[PDB]
């Protein structure tokens, strides 16, 4: 008999709501929990694991294991570009399919650093030096090694240590960016050049390959849960 | 919350954090300060929305079917399985084993079919939804004796009211549901590969309690599955190609990713 | 669930073709078992024509004239997963698509076999 | 004054020695152990041979050619015909065990190549028919290594597993396979890869015949290459040793 | 028996919740459960690797 | 919860637990450890759902009848008895005497009948359900003076609202209801065998308060019986053959169980 | 006059629910409980009693 | 006068219930009433029989 | 509350409060007592309704669109932007940057269109409103697979119920929303001037879940925006001329104010 | 099961009301507040600032 | 956890409010937040100007 | 367990990494530092950008042929057209700075050669 | 958003008129890209007549006879903001109003260009 007054939003169904409902089966005993390894409590932990990135995604290479490999060789020249791609993990084709890119497609905003690990896959006798570099937005993608040096760069020397890590620092005006392509929140440009020519001895291949691994740092977050475009369905299975 | 950036100064030393080995399978975990000069920053960002409970706890339409108040088809039967809809399914397939509580919400709408019937008077339509456990008897016809629902949970809903909602506790003979089963049900390995006695919940039956009107009426029922108190184990790579059959992970070979004009290209 | 539902069988003339339609039932399945063997002719004439039917624990062998007293269930249990038929006299006409339907509410399973006679 | 890249593992009456290794990946941080009295289900006393069952079992070698797409193995199935381990399961209904996978491959400084060693639990594989499921023989090859296909498998009416290397038969990106416990062998830095895997399953114990808990896949992202006058034939040997195995349900042998 | 908890608020307040069913599976989702342990996925190696020290 | 398995070792002794005598009518109660070597196991399973309150406390449809807003049949009368529906009845017959509280829920649906009437305007139909105690006056006609319900509990329900529900306290001259009565009501034993003054609750009368529309309308009322605070005494064997008459346990002789091809056969 | 908001599942009838309903007859005195032997409190107790099993269930 | 009780939960939380009717037969079912006493059905014998000792 | 007037007496002195300089840009802040004799007054008036929370926290209709249950147009899509309605927009443009929470209320009404269709029977119409985040997939057709709303928040409303209402938290990559942006999105300044990645919320999609009736029906949906917990920075002059385009502050030159017959005139 | 009685004004939409509504997006982290100059907390403060007044508003 | 606050009344009484959502952005408007600081807009000059003293 | 022949120098936003180096020669034992108030002369406050001016600037590469006589550079002049450093001096009358010279050259075990890297102040030619 | 949507282009006869319809897409835009070039004649005959259409990543050059093989997209990317066309042979008839429509759900952008030939 308590007087009550309903408010706008009664008898409505919001998919994302948190209410209590009656149990279809009362007093039901569920199976006791068992210890299973690799328990996940947050999506970010998955996104912090290195994922192989296919930089050479061109032509029919995406249908072969050649998309992931990156070609390098001995050339009578210096300052040439090994590769180049923009900082768009959510939108760029290169990162759209990585463990990081796959997870970044269920969220709208993303803010944090990105780690790029490059592993030389040449012979023990093969030696070389590259210039990994990241260039800020508002400047045209560097076209020569002189221009690229101006921005954040790391001289990498081939050595007993197989891989060198390039850590892209978070340099943005706003606190967050957009996973979808957006001109206002431009990320930046990542390029690699030859600091020194690859040098090999006789009876040794002068053509090698490199592998790229992209993971997130300890200051990476995402927001606004949204659906992933990738998965499509016209009828039920 | 997240880690705060630490201020650093130019350093010349034998220490080489950037140089490492990826063969060890160990993530480098190198902060920005190791390779460049940074300024102390007090980050206030929090990883709240990236949690599995926040990621998987949303209502997603898994299956919609229709029935009539007359004609051959008078009732609709669907077995509980989340592989019917690609969206919710892909999110669930992210891990190998998931244990969670289930919340069911049903949206029912009735549409009048074209007919030559005249003087049609419609009475508020009442719909009955009955849940049948595995091994329970299934109704042969709309006017069958099974609809008594003595020991079978059932819900009666009248049009113009908020959608019916019930909460189901985790049901699995095994400790946790298995998204992917590698093997055969038969000890002789002569059966459908990947079939498991696990993940079997029940069957849902929906019918019109009363005809309501002389003229024909068709109603479509949509089932929504919202996971609750979810737990995840063994993370795996997300689906790359479109789902063909719910029963088997059968797929069509798909390009690793989209192509670009050439390497060194900043656009798609 | 029927093992290898889509498949193709090749046999020579007069060699007796055995068509395997072995199924497996889920716990939910609790309805009456109904087997229906329907054949689609390679002639391109009316398709989905039934030849042999098993319902109410009884067998009917007269739904298609060409196959008169030639289609018999290989197994006598029939309730068991094995629900297969064998044509004794293979003929040139035999070439066509054979569909096996196992219906136990809830859930219907179908198997399609392409038959070619050399 | 020990060397970081130098190791030796001793199980039963078998010892492996590597003088050029990267490290050891212990699964998800869990070390193989026996079943506790709280998480057990089968009331009968478990039988643990320990010395006979847990020991290194060397499988047949494979050749790493310049066009080799990749190879895969079913850990429970692979050791089903080798030693007491194989015999033990033949006479037992239930079985719970952990494994240590030591993939071995060596080459000269001049030789250049790269391989990926990864353990994938519950690796359900697709089929080319898109309506049927892969046959037991195609999926499981005891005393052999099933290989991957570069070009896509033809679609028809049959039971052939889609061996596509890029989807890897699971319809997922090959590059995203690093999420599972893994290690890389590069002929410029590594000469072997060692991985320790704890038993992982939804149930406490399961049948070891019709069910396979884990799957070992060796895939080369960058191909094997070398100049003329060098060694053309380069083999790869896989040694797998069960850890903390225990069985329940004694019965007449068979499957 | 009312449980008072802190609402999700920005940086740089409280809510009361009661359970009307004894089923417990009839409760709301545990949205405020943020725990991080990536150590197992990122580094499942046997020997701890210091960043200052060279890998091999 | 349930008993935890106890670890045992090989034992050679005079003690013989397995050997016993079934003539004493005493259950052997031999654990697995007595006849074989077991390992200590900490069972966490609980016998919660097997309790009588959990088994019998569910709503089960016992009887549905219909009435019209015009024509001869204008009201429907049913005497309260749970033997009308075989399901709820079989569960109740598991014991000899059961004492419990009763909860009644009614689902009412109206269907428009075919007619040549034109310009049909329907007004929200209101249904009145009246409960009559044993010995109370029963209405002769729909427009009778009895429907005043001065001392008879009655409920008025308007369509488009949640179904009407009322709670009834245990009513029985005797200490508990008797499922099976062996004997005759008459001291001379010349009457229907098994008839008892016990288990008599009342009669339910349902009618339309207003005609509502010029066109004919037929409404069906379903009665649901949910036992509460149930108590059971003297367990008995479950029914083996199909129920023929509610009044008497009369049955048709039925095969003890289904047959198989032969002994030593592992299948049906 | 308290502001209230209904949620999905209002005015619905779930057979297996546990709610409170008004009493059709108020202030009713029920018959006092009497001691009856073989009281049952759980179905399992019944299932723990030996039952004769027809192993030779063949033919007639 | 609110009664706080423990919800049914798995192994290896609380709910508040109030009575708005004085009828008491108008209350909810006693679902949480698990008591076991099979001794009467299983062994209604006069002399206790020890398993170690032979029956006769 | 407000300041209380202070009693004053005739004063002859060198102090000159009224004389001052407006060039300094400093408000004189001279009370009435400085230039004339006043009496002490205890003011009880309070500046409660003039607060920004009281000024901006009211529901204002921002956009209304319609859809049909048949024909070409079956669904309606609108991108979230408050510049659609001049009223709410002018109030918001009072400051440069505003940070606030948002509350959305939708009013949906269905009107039957003229048609030759006969025997029309209508079933309670159910409307689904889906919110899509920036970069999320947009449904191509009414019966598209996107309406599954797995990760997209959506609300289902049935006619005859209170309007659906949801609360949205402040969403902006930047610290606060920017009412006026001076510049170009492109670093090369070759794009629409004033375009900003800020103030982008999402898109709203509204459709009929079921056809409901054979005859055509058209429904109009009105979106209401109520700011909550609002904050304001840098006040600016109010709009003097009528709004032409939502995208740009483009205006038509307007007379500073209305004219009068001459100076010294007390009327308009 | 608590007895309730609705009063005049139920299921009505008053533009100027102060009620609680469910959040469309749960557990959402908003951007931290930044110090911006000239913050306004009351309309009167704006109205206390001198404004040039066009007294000679006649003709063109 | 109920918050008791004073109702808006004339010059010359109390209300209780509870939060049923943990979202916090799901709360009602802060109507009773009256704060005045016009000093910045009216006088943003560097040197304080006394009314008694002449401006220049 | 660090390696004697392994090093990394971090200046500004640029990092160099060498996995085969001999050591580091710090001039005449003096480390680059700012001007003290006792040895200064210009009374005006000095301007120190620090992050922009002090950072690694990579010059164009040269080819080491079998007959290559040698190469030379003027440190102040070389960086006069590169980055803020070049711009800073263009707008400033006086300038005082120190340098770190990292010459890089790599070859295979089979390759054999030798080079001399030396900094000569006031090298009047 | 199209840069300078309303504008007027003046060129002499036979000088090749280039019409600029460069656009910019908002984050919400996620639908299929559809370009539609419709011309309104100065003749005052039926207006809104399409000349060239770009949909489904394909180009159609036959919707208006007078301009036969004379309208080609200047840029080959087309997905890029630049979606411009150029008429090679300017003629006296060319005088009219040209409308450029860029449709990417949600949101439609339109540009109108007045063409005068001296």
């Amino acid at each position: 008999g308590l007087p009550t007054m309903n408010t706008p939003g009664s008898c409505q169904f919001l998919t994302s709501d948190d209410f209590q409902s009656p149990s279809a089966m009362p007093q039901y005993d569920v199976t006791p929990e068992m210890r299973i390894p690799g328990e996940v409590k947050n999506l970010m932990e998955i996104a912090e694991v290195d994922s192989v990135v296919p930089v050479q995604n061109v032509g029919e290479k995406v249908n072969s294991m050649e998309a992931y490999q990156i070609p390098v060789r001995s050339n009578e020249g210096s300052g040439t570009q090994v590769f180049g791609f923009p900082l768009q993990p959510g939108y760029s084709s290169v990162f759209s399919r990585t463990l990081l890119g796959e997870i970044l497609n269920y969220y709208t905003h993303w803010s944090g650093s990105i780690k790029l690990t490059f592993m030389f896959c040449g012979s023990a006798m093969a030696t070389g030096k590259f210039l990994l570099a990241y260039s800020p937005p508002g400047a045209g993608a560097p076209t020569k090694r002189v221009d690229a040096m101006l921005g954040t760069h790391v001289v990498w020397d081939v050595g007993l240590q197989s891989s060198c890590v390039l850590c892209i620092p978070w340099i943005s005006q706003t606190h967050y960016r957009y996973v979808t392509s957006d001109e206002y929140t431009a990320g930046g440009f990542i390029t690699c050049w030859y600091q020194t020519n690859i040098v090999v001895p006789a009876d040794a291949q002068s053509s090698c390959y490199i592998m790229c691994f992209v993971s997130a740092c300890n200051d990476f977050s995402v927001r606004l849960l949204k659906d992933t475009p990738f998965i499509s369905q016209q009828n039920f299975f | 919350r997240v880690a705060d950036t630490v201020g650093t100064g130019p350093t010349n030393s034998e220490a080489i954090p950037a140089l490492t080995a990826a063969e060890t399978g160990h993530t480098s975990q190198v902060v920005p300060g190791d390779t460049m000069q940074t300024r102390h920053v007090k980050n206030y960002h929090s990883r709240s929305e990236s949690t599995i409970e926040n990621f998987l706890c949303r209502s997603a339409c898994v299956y919609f079917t229709e029935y009539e108040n007359s004609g051959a088809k008078r009732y609709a039967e669907w077995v509980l399985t989340p592989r019917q809809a690609a969206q919710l399914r892909r999110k669930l397939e992210f891990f190998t084993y998931v244990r969670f509580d289930l919340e069911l919400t049903f949206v029912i709408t009735s549409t009048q079919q074209p007919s030559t019937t005249q003087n049609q008077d419609a009475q508020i339509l009442t719909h009955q939804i009955m849940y049948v456990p595995p091994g329970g008897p299934v109704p042969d016809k709309v006017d069958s004796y099974v609809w008594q629902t003595s020991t079978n949970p059932s819900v009666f809903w009248t049009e113009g009211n908020a959608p019916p909602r019930m909460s189901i506790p985790f049901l699995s003979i095994g400790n946790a549901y298995s998204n992917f089963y590698d093997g055969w049900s038969e000890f002789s390995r002569n059966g459908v590969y990947g079939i498991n006695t696990l993940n079997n919940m029940g069957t849902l039956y929906a019918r019109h309690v009363n005809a309501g009107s002389t003229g024909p009426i068709k109603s479509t029922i949509r089932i929504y599955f919202k996971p609750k108190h979810v737990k995840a184990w063994i993370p795996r790579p997300p689906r790359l190609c479109q789902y063909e059959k719910a029963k088997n992970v059968n797929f069509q070979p798909s390009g690793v990713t989209t192509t670009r004009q050439s390497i060194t290209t900043m656009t798609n | 669930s029927i093992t290898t539902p889509e498949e193709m069988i090749e046999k020579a003339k007069g060699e007796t073709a055995y068509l395997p339609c072995k199924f497996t039932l889920s716990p939910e399945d609790q309805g009456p078992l109904d087997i229906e063997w329907l054949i689609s002719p390679a002639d391109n004439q009316k398709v989905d024509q039934v030849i042999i039917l098993y319902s109410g624990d009884k067998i009917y062998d007269d739904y298609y004239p060409d196959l008169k007293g030639r289609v018999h269930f290989t197994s006598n249990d029939l309730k068991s997963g094995d629900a297969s038929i064998n044509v004794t006299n293979l003929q040139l006409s035999d070439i066509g698509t054979y569909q096996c339907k196992v219906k136990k509410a809830p859930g219907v399973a179908n198997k399609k076999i392409h038959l070619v006679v050399l | 004054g020990y060397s970081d890249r130098a190791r030796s593992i001793t199980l039963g009456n078998s010892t492996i020695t590597t003088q050029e290794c990267a490290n050891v990946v212990v699964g998800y941080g869990v070390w193989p152990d026996y079943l506790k009295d709280s998480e057990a289900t089968a009331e009968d006393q478990p039988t643990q041979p320990d010395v006979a069952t847990c020991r290194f079992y060397t499988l047949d070698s494979v050749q790493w050619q310049k066009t080799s797409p990749g190879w895969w193995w079913k850990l429970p199935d692979a050791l089903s015909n080798l030693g007491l381990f194989g015999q033990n399961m033949q006479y037992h209904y239930l079985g719970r065990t952990g494994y240590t996978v030591h993939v071995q491959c060596n080459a000269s400084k001049f030789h250049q190549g790269c391989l990926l060693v990864v353990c994938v639990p519950e690796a359900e594989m697709g089929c080319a028919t898109l309506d049927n499921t892969p046959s037991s023989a195609e999926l499981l090859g005891g005393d052999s290594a099933k290989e991957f296909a570069d070009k896509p498998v033809a679609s028809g009416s049959n039971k052939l597993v889609q061996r596509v290397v890029y989807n890897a038969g699971m319809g997922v990106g090959v590059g995203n396979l690093t999420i599972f416990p893994h290690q890389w062998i590069n002929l410029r830095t590594n000469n072997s890869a060692t991985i320790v895997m704890p038993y992982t399953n939804s149930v406490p114990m399961d049948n070891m015949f019709r069910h396979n808990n884990v799957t070992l896949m060796v895939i080369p992202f960058v191909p094997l290459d070398y100049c003329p006058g060098s060694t053309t034939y380069v083999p790869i040997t896989v040694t797998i040793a069960p850890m903390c195995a225990e069985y329940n349900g004694l019965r007449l042998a068979g499957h | 028996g009312a449980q008072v908890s802190t609402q999700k608020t920005g940086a740089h307040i409280h809510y009361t919740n009661i359970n009307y069913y004894k089923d417990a599976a009839s409760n709301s989702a545990n949205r405020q459960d943020f725990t991080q342990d990536p150590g197992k996925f990122t580094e499942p190696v046997k020997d701890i690797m210091i960043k200052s020290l060279p890998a091999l």
Side-chain angles (χ1 to χ4, degrees), chain D residues 93-146:
Chain D
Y93 164 46
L94 292 167
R96 174 188 176 274
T97 183
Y99 304 98
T100 173
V101 288
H102 178 65
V103 179
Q104 319 156 207
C105 178
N106 70 293
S108 170
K109 299 281 183 57
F110 297 72
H111 286 85
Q112 73 180 22
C114 183
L115 274 171
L116 160 77
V117 186
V118 52
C119 279
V120 181
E122 302 284 355
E124 185 174 356
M125 300 202 168
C127 178
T129 293
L130 291 161
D131 195 25
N132 295 359
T133 52
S135 175
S136 172
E138 302 290 333
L139 257 170
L140 314 184
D143 300 285
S144 279
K146 287 297 179 173

Side-chain angles (χ1 to χ4, degrees), chain B residues 96-175:
Chain B
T96 319
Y97 317 107
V98 286
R99 172 188 183 108
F100 59 69
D101 278 321
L102 181 66
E103 183 160 53
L104 289 80
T105 311
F106 313 98
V107 176
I108 315 184
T109 42
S110 293
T111 295
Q112 169 193 5
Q113 299 311 133
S115 166
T116 62
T117 295
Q118 315 192 23
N119 307 324
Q120 291 160 156
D121 200 19
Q123 311 293 321
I124 314 293
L125 277 169
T126 295
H127 311 256
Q128 170 187 3
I129 318 169
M130 176 191 47
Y131 170 76
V132 181
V138 284
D140 186 350
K141 46 185 188 176
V142 48
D143 61 33
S144 162
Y145 75 104
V146 184
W147 302 93
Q148 284 169 7
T149 76
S150 175
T151 329
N152 287 329
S154 73
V155 35
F156 291 78
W157 180 76
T158 174
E159 288 194 352
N161 287 78
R165 189 181 299 182
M166 56 185 56
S167 190
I168 290 197
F170 162 83
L171 69 157
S172 176
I173 325 172
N175 289 253

Side-chain angles (χ1 to χ4, degrees), chain D residues 35-38 40-46 246:
Chain D
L35 190 48
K36 301 183 168 191
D37 294 341
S38 46
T41 173
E43 305 178 340
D44 199 36
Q45 172 71 26
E246 44 183 350

Side-chain angles (χ1 to χ4, degrees), chain D residues 86-94 209 247-254:
Chain D
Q87 284 299 350
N88 265 293
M89 46 188 284
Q90 287 171 199
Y91 281 93
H92 281 100
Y93 164 46
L94 292 167
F209 284 115
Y247 314 79
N248 280 68
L250 190 58
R251 46 166 180 89
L252 185 62

Side-chain angles (χ1 to χ4, degrees), chain A residues 161, chain B residues 14 16 19-20, chain D residues 4, chain E residues 49-56:
Chain A
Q161 301 304 331
Chain B
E14 294 180 11
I16 33 175
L19 287 182
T20 186
Chain D
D4 272 346
Chain E
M49 298 175 54
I50 309 168
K51 47 166 55 63
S52 302
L53 293 187
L56 304 163

Side-chain angles (χ1 to χ4, degrees), chain C residues 21-112:
Chain C
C21 186
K22 307 182 180 180
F23 60 82
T24 302
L25 302 165
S26 313
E28 301 84 12
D29 303 16
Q30 288 293 125
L33 192 100
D34 180 357
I35 312 292
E36 174 194 2
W37 276 87
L38 60 154
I39 171 202
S40 159
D43 195 32
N44 212 9
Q45 53 184 358
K46 306 177 182 58
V47 294
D48 300 349
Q49 298 299 132
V50 188
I51 162 61
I52 185 173
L53 180 81
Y54 171 73
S55 311
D57 300 349
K58 284 177 301 177
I59 314 185
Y60 305 71
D61 309 324
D62 197 16
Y63 284 113
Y64 185 66
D66 301 355
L67 301 167
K68 207 316 166 192
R70 287 226 315 272
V71 189
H72 321 96
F73 278 103
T74 320
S75 190
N76 59 344
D77 39 61
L78 285 190
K79 238 55 181 176
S80 177
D82 187 20
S84 304
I85 61 163
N86 50 347
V87 182
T88 297
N89 179 319
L90 275 205
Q91 281 193 2
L92 193 57
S93 293
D94 291 9
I95 64 183
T97 303
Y98 295 78
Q99 185 187 7
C100 171
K101 282 186 179 175
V102 178
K103 184 185 178 302
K104 174 164 279 185
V108 186
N110 63 321
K111 157 142 200 174
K112 296 181 179 180

